[PDB]
Design a protein around this nucleic acid. Sequence first.
RNA 1: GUAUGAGUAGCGAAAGACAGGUGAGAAUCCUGUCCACCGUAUGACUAAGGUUUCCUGGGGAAGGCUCGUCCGCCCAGGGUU
RNA 2: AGUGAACCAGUACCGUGAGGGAAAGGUGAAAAGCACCCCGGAAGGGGAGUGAAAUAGAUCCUGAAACCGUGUGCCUACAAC
Lengths: 124, 44, 56, 112, 89
Amino acid sequence: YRKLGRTSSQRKAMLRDITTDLIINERIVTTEARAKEVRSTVEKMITLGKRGDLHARRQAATFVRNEVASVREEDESIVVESALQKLFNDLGPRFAERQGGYTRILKTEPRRGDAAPMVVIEFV
Amino acid sequence: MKRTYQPNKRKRQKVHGFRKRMSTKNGRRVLASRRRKGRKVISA
Amino acid sequence: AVPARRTSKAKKAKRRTHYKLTIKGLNACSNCGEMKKSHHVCPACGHYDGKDVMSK
Amino acid sequence: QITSAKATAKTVRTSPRKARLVIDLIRGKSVADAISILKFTPNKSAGIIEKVLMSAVANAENNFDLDVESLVVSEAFVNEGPTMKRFRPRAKGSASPINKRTSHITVVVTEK
Amino acid sequence: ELLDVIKRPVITEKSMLAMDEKKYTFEVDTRANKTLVKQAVESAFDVKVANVNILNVRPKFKRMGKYAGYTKKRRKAIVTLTEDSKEIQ
RNA sequence: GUAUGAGUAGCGAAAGACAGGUGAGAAUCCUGUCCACCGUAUGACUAAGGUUUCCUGGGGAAGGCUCGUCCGCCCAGGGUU
RNA sequence: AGUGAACCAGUACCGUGAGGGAAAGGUGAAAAGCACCCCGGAAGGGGAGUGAAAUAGAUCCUGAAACCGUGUGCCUACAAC
Ligand SMILES: [Zn+2]
């Protein structure tokens, strides 16, 4: 399952960060190994967001990052959505009637300082 | 790992300076041999 | 271990015959014609598989 | 009428051995093919040879020639330039030298 | 010698602000006093002086054309007035 | 002065990721957010020693073990009461 | 070579110090030292011009060898040099 140049707790930190991005942004540029490991992790989060209940919420909250916002919203207030609240109010209901496969990867180009092959991973 | 050169301003003037070279008869041999060579600095 | 004899020009160049570069699969885009790497997005126009991808 | 045009870059700060791996990929090609081949090689010297090739083409168009569609890469080579000399400190108080090498790069294009 | 003492004024951005509190900056002679400068300024403009302040400035290494060496030394005095003014431009 | 060894050894303890800026060009510069490291010190002040390295505006040939739009580097002005 | 030193040399540099101590001359008769245009961030180059000559363009008289390339007439994958 792809060690990614890191120890066991740094791999977990890095994945927890890259999947909370893409929940907040829905489209991201990364290398090609990270993108595959992340497709697996993010879709595991979406099938908990579709389950809906309290037990599923507390299961996801062990993996989604906390003090991050994702706001395009104002009726009249400063009303913030929490990137776990988005998972449960927005992204689950979106993919209600689709079975697995909520993402897709495209290949672009090697990075200048590296020759690392880069990639875009998006949702629909 | 302490090395040999430890800098100090007073010591350098008191051991190697102009007045120390002027107070002995062999210091003035040094100063004359340096003036005879063309040194731009004849005494520290 | 140290080289006991220097190596000549012929033997150096005979070593260096598997030391080259390759330029593998290059095709023409279906949308804009210019050359591009297969299974990749086209860098000239941002089209992959007959649709627009690097736009919003 | 002359049907040929050259450009050259002098004392570029890359090594002449690595620049030769890229320039053997381009010799004898049409100018149309050489540009795309250079755009998809990620080696540092690939984009420098691109500028020299594009100067050869502009010279052909403006000073003498026409017919960008007929042109072909006929000659190409990489020579050595003067080297800078440096020293890197080693273990136990000694030091060893380091060469900073340079290249002259020249491309020629003919109408065919 | 009272007329070789003051050399010229200093005109920089930190010295324009001082002219608004009644303070004036001059490059003065090395070997000059706080008191001697005060006498010279009271003589050459007919003002009344409160408080000269005085500093020394180190030379700077410069290097133009593979030849290097230092600029001059400098002395800077800042003169405060009670109530009057000098017009330099 | 130039080769061979050879495009080889090495690149000097350690946690980053993404979004957006600038730009000819960005893993390496700027801004943000979360994450991680020291905390009788990897925090604050000072005597030696160094001697302009300090601040502001520009630059990218060399120095920086990669890169560089950046810098204790380079050019111009200024600062110590 | 001739003074260590034909050139900003008892200098740069090395050492706590006494002391040790280098490298580095030549465009053209005359700067007439390349206005203008094109590729390029620049460097560099190609035209056009100066000039008796620029492959005399400032790394500038002549321009040997080592060493590094490009093109071709002939030979070479059963052979112990
Ligand atoms: Zn295309």
